[PDB]
Amino acid sequence: RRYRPTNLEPGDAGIYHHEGHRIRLTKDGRCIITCKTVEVYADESMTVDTPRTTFTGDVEIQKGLGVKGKSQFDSNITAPDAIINGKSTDKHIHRGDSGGTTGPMQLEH
Amino acid sequence: GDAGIYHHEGHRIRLTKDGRCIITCKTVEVYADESMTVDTPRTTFTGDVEIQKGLGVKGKSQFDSNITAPDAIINGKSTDKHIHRGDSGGTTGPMQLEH
Amino acid sequence: MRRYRPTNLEPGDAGIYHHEGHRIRLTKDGRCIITCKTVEVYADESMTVDTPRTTFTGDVEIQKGLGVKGKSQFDSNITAPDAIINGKSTDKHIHRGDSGGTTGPMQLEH
Ligand SMILES: [Ca+2]
Ligand SMILES: [Cl-]
Ligand SMILES: [Fe+3]
Structure with missing residues (x-):
């Protein structure tokens, strides 16, 4: 499966690679990361503070x-x-x- | 100074002092077609x-x-x-x- | 930590980069890499990770x-x-x- 959405709306903020993967902030408080792989290297810790993951x-x-x-x-x-x-x-x-x-x-x- | 991306509604991603990466929003959706790897001592x-x-x-x-x-x-x-x-x-x- | 990995900026990279050296980088072949001391995600409602393996x-x-x-x-x-x-x-x-x-x-x- 490949999912590299390209739509943009007024007000979007983001980090965009020309191949099509991106990190996007859009309306209604949404952050959407779309890519092949995500790697996180955090020397000390990761905290995910949310009611549901x-x-x-x-x-x-x-x-x-x-x-x-x-x-x-x-x-x-x-x-x-x-x-x-x-x-x-x-x-x-x-x-x-x-x-x-x-x-x-x-x-x- | 910080580095970051900011939406007018108030959600943002920021890098700040002491090696902090901070994402603050209503929902976070991560789509990774292959995998996600989190290399950290504690999540x-x-x-x-x-x-x-x-x-x-x-x-x-x-x-x-x-x-x-x-x-x-x-x-x-x-x-x-x-x-x-x-x-x-x-x-x-x-x-x-x-x- | 896993070290000895490629970290030098390539043509076409897009990211945000702090002076101290921590960063969020998108690089070739569909890769997103977050490198830092601490990651703090706050999602008022929810977080969804849609990936075959985490x-x-x-x-x-x-x-x-x-x-x-x-x-x-x-x-x-x-x-x-x-x-x-x-x-x-x-x-x-x-x-x-x-x-x-x-x-x-x-x-x-x-
Ligand atoms: Ca008996
Ligand atoms: Cl018995
Ligand atoms: Fe018994």
Whole structure:
């Protein structure tokens, strides 16, 4: 897919490359960047301060993730372990129905 | 002096002292037909984030509030369908709703 | 940081450039490059990134909620106060036991 819009409106402000990619400010408070690739090199940090950020594609995080609010995953997640309320899911047990202990989490069957 | 681009309505992109790049607007739309790469030690979103395809995380993840998912495959084992060796040497049934 | 990359101005470049050396540059072959110490984006309503893949080389912190439509692969441990899996609390889940009764809730590993 190639998307290099060229329309301009009265009052637009921008940075424009002759190949067609650009950064544009236009009416109704909109900033629109249209290009092949965006690279950000920020020595210290990037902050995105907005009520909602949406990524339409895949996201890869090469170090860690922290989330303060609730997370909703619509498809399966995979992890080597999930520590849930201090308890390893991989190795958790239960008090069994005869008052002993079960073995650890096992493969479905 | 600063460098920047400014719209009459008030939104702008500015470069200013101490290596700051500042974008201030109502909406930001980034269209990148191939990819976006953000090379920085820490990225912080102050609001919600929605990812419409998949997520991959190499490092540890810390969720401070509950997560929800149709299944979590933990060390190769379905959480939704997992069982245990029972306390009498048989097998339990699969994960069931809390009592 | 990834260094040793081309940074010299080419014919046709368009940008904004601060005296200190940070910059936003558009260069050949459809490339946009932001180089600085800090990036601060503020969008009063929303930000949308429409791209097949977004990569963050460092840590990410999300201060409100996260939603993911596709599959998620976590290569290291995750931690949460609870995981509601197919409608069932992981923290509090039970099983039918091996003797016709029911087990207690999830307990710490041995
Ligand atoms: Ca039993
Ligand atoms: Cl049992
Ligand atoms: Fe269990």
